[PDB]
Amino acid sequence: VCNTCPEKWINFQRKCYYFGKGTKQWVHARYACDDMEGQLVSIHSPEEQDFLTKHASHTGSWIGLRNLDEFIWVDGSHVDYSNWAPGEPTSRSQGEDCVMMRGSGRWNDAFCDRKLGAWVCDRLATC
């Protein structure tokens, strides 16, 4: 059984999630996750998305998705499952390289220096 979570983290399947609060730019949230032995959340299934939507802040949260050159998760994994809001991401939005999750759970690309009140970390559950 792999459902062991560190204190303050919530289990879902083989992963642990941390629903962070506090005003952060994308890179500030990326390091807040790293310093807690986690990473900004990577989403790989509609079941995982549904669980996140249920615990997510109504005012928007940073997720581990970013445009490098192609959108890639901070942990290195490529996008299989996606939950972009209609029309997203837009090709012509130069500089809107980071991804936030709305209260609905749908994804929007955004300027990296935008300050959001929430961010979500993930890590593997222990046994």
Side-chain angles (χ1 to χ4, degrees), residues 8-54:
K8 301 170 196 179
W9 295 69
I10 304 162
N11 177 248
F12 184 72
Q13 298 172 316
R14 279 186 142 109
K15 286 164 73 179
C16 303
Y17 302 85
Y18 183 80
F19 295 94
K21 298 165 189 174
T23 302
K24 309 192 180 322
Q25 271 182 55
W26 188 91
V27 74
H28 182 347
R30 194 222 158 117
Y31 288 104
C33 288
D34 298 347
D35 285 355
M36 274 184 190
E37 292 95 89
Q39 278 176 306
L40 270 171
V41 76
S42 64
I43 314 163
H44 298 294
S45 69
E47 299 77 35
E48 189 171 9
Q49 181 62 71
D50 292 358
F51 164 86
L52 297 167
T53 303
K54 284 167 192 170

Side-chain angles (χ1 to χ4, degrees), residues 67-109:
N67 181 12
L68 295 178
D69 205 286
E70 203 178 276
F71 284 86
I72 296 165
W73 300 105
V74 306
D75 50 42
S77 63
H78 293 71
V79 180
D80 40 15
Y81 170 79
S82 74
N83 194 39
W84 293 108
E88 298 281 281
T90 56
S91 170
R92 281 197 86 175
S93 44
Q94 164 82 74
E96 308 187 48
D97 301 330
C98 293
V99 181
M100 59 100 60
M101 178 174 66
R102 298 194 63 88
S104 60
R106 299 195 290 192
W107 313 345
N108 289 183
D109 55 14

